[PDB]
Amino acid sequence: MRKGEELFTGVVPILIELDGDVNGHKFFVRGEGEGDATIGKLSLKFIATTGKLPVPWPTLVTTLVQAFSRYPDHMKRHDFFKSAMPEGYVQERTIYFKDDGTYKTRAEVKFEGCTLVNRIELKGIDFKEDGNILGHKLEYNFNSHKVYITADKQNNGIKANFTIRHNVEDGSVQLADHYQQNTPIGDGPVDLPDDHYLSTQTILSKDLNEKRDHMVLLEYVTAAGI
Amino acid sequence: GEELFTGVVPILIELDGDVNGHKFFVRGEGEGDATIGKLSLKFIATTGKLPVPWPTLVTTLVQAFSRYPDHMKRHDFFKSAMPEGYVQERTIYFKDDGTYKTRAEVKFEGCTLVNRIELKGIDFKEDGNILGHKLEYNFNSHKVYITADKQNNGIKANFTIRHNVEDGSVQLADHYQQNTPIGDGPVDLPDDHYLSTQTILSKDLNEKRDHMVLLEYVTAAGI
Numbered sequence: 001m002r003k004g005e006e007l008f009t010g011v012v013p014i015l016i017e018l019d020g021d022v023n024g025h026k027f028f029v030r031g032e033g034e035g036d037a038t039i040g041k042l043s044l045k046f047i048a049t050t051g052k053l054p055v056p057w058p059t060l061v062t063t064l065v066q067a068f069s070r071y072p073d074h075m076k077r078h079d080f081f082k083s084a085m086p087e088g089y090v091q092e093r094t095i096y097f098k099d100d101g102t103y104k105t106r107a108e109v110k111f112e113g114c115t116l117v118n119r120i121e122l123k124g125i126d127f128k129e130d131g132n133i134l135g136h137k138l139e140y141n142f143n144s145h146k147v148y149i150t151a152d153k154q155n156n157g158i159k160a161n162f163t164i165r166h167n168v169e170d171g172s173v174q175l176a177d178h179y180q181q182n183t184p185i186g187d188g189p190v191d192l193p194d195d196h197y198l199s200t201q202t203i204l205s206k207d208l209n210e211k212r213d214h215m216v217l218l219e220y221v222t223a224a225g226i
Numbered sequence: 227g228e229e230l231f232t233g234v235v236p237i238l239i240e241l242d243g244d245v246n247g248h249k250f251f252v253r254g255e256g257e258g259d260a261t262i263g264k265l266s267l268k269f270i271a272t273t274g275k276l277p278v279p280w281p282t283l284v285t286t287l288v289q290a291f292s293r294y295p296d297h298m299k300r301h302d303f304f305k306s307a308m309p310e311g312y313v314q315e316r317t318i319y320f321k322d323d324g325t326y327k328t329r330a331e332v333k334f335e336g337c338t339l340v341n342r343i344e345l346k347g348i349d350f351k352e353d354g355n356i357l358g359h360k361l362e363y364n365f366n367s368h369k370v371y372i373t374a375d376k377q378n379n380g381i382k383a384n385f386t387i388r389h390n391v392e393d394g395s396v397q398l399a400d401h402y403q404q405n406t407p408i409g410d411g412p413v414d415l416p417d418d419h420y421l422s423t424q425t426i427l428s429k430d431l432n433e434k435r436d437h438m439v440l441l442e443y444v445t446a447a448g449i
Contacts, residue, residue: 001336002238009255010236114337 005082007111008037008067014044015117016064022124023101023134025054031064031217035116037082040070042219047212055124056138057215058166061202062178063093063105065118069198069221078193078223080149080158080182086111087186089157095164098175101127110185132166132174139167142202148225151192157183158193197225227308228299230334231260231290237267238340239287245347246324246357248277254287256440258339260305263293265442270435278347279361280427280438281389285401286316286328288341289370292421292444301416301446303372303381303405309334310409312380321398324350333408355389355397362390365425371449374415380406381416418449 016031033044046057046064053060067081081089088110095103107120127134143165152159159181166174184190198221205216239254256267269280269287276283290304304312311333318326330343350357366388375382383403391397407413421444428439 002338010257 004085005071005076005079007085008035008082010038011036012068013115014042014065015112015115016044016046016120017118018060018064018120018122020055020060020120020122020124022055022103022122023127023129026050027053027055029053029060029064031215033217035065035068037068037070040068040221042068042217042221044217044219045207045210046215046217047210048214049212052213055133056136056166057140058138058142058204059097059103059133059176060122060215061142061204061217062095062164062176063103063107063120063122064217065109065116066198066221067109067116068219069223071223075196075223075226077191078149078196078226080151080191080193081109083189083191084184084186087184087188089185090183092181094179096177097127097131097133098177100131100133100174101125108185132168137169138174139169140204141167142204143167144199144201147198147200148195149193149198149223150195152181152183153192155181155183156190156192157181194226196223198223227306228302230308231258231305233261234259235291236338237265237288238335238338239267239269239343240341241283241287241343241345243278243283243345243347245278245326245345246350246352248357249273250276250278252276252283252287254438254440258288258291260291260293263291263444265291265440265444267440267442268430268433269438269440270433271437272435275436278356279359279389280363281361281365282320282326282356282399283345283438284365284425284427284440285318285387285399286326286330286343286345287440288332288339289421289444290332290339292446294446298419298446298448300414301419303374303414303416306412306414307380307405307407307409308339310407312408313406315404315406317402319400319402320350320354320356321400322351323354323356323397324348331408355391360392361397362392363427364390365427366390367422367424370421370423371418372416372420373418375404375406376415378404378406379413379415380404419446420449421446 031046254269389397
């Protein structure tokens with residue numbers, strides 16, 4: 001039976017579910033689509049099943065499957081994310097929105113039957129009602145980012161810390177400091193990588209026939225930089 | 227078994243061959259869609275240039291991806307044997323030339339439909355169309371007649387493949403086929419019927435290895 005990186009040589013169906021509560025405002029997001037790690041591509045559509053989101057869609061992007069990064073041939077020995085499959089990995093983050101609130105997230109990314117599934121609990125606290133996030137002042141787009149990945153030997157996993165730059169409607173920028181740690185769910189051998197980075201690029205768009213609050217996402221990610 | 231084929235299914239195929247002592251290995255991957263009777267696959271000969279023409283391996287390289295119309299769904303043996311799967315055996319007699327004997331296990335491994343084959347060919351002429359590589363790189367349309375095999379709780383099949391030869395002459399390959407379920411418990415024993423098959427063989431312009439890209443459309447019809 002195919003394991004690890006062997007599970008990613010073709011197109012893989014994806015389900016993503018996010019259970020969220022920001023300042024007491026509860027919401028739920030379901031996304032479906034596909035990933036193709038051979039080219040590093042994600043194609044997804046997300047729907048807010050609970051009605052109009054109380055936060056901007058861009059603030060959810062990093063939370064909403066780095067297993068679909070393209071690790072080129074010389075990098076495959078550093079691919080922790082796929083090595084944890086199919087049993088999967090836990091992904092935890094703290095996200096500090098500068099001059100505003102905090103997201104805390106825990107997710108599991110794993111195969112459930114034949115589908116790659118990302119299941120998330122998100123809790124947001126201390127947001128300002130008239131800030132960029134509850135006030136919906138963020139542009140509907142996403143910038144490119146470089147995510148440095150380092151091994152976390154004590155946890156048999158990896159960690160990462162990076163800052164997301166969200167463009168604001170008035171020309172300013174909303175920074176979001178991310179602290180991330182991932183651990184395998186299974187016990188089998190995983191790949192603990194040398195320091196490297198994921199180069200991430202993202203386009204957000206809409207579906208003209210969807211009436212529900214939604215996000216269409218296209219993402220291209222490659223690993224490099226040992 | 228049929229509920230495993232309501233969507234697109236990933237496929238892995240491995241063939242371990244020896245024809246007249248020439249040993250080769252072929253690995254193929256792609257996907258099948260039984261709702262439309264479609265196969266889309268790419269094969270690589272990992273052992274270098276094949277000692278035999280790619281078209282002669284086509285029938286050996288997952289009839290569970292045949293499209294069975296609604297009124298014929300009770301005659302779909304291949305799907306009903308899943309996920310435990312079935313053993314597929316053939317003898318293939320190339321006219322005025324050698325013979326392939328094949329044994330394959332077709333079954334689910336995880337979410338992948340896998341076809342694992344052993345092939346042995348003997349008494350091929352070194353200057354014949356097969357070892358001499360004189361067959362056109364294509365495949366014609368064929369009818370596969372399927373009959374129930376109650377003794378063995380499976381099916382049998384017979385058909386003749388017409389391989390076009392480079393000089394306009396034709397190389398016939400008579401197929402004798404038997405399928406037997408791996409698991410126990412209910413399977414579908416069909417009335418006599420056939421599969422209508424259409425195949426395109428192509429190449430990947432970026433692929434330097436000896437390889438074959440395959441697209442196939444198969445539908446079942448009453449007899």
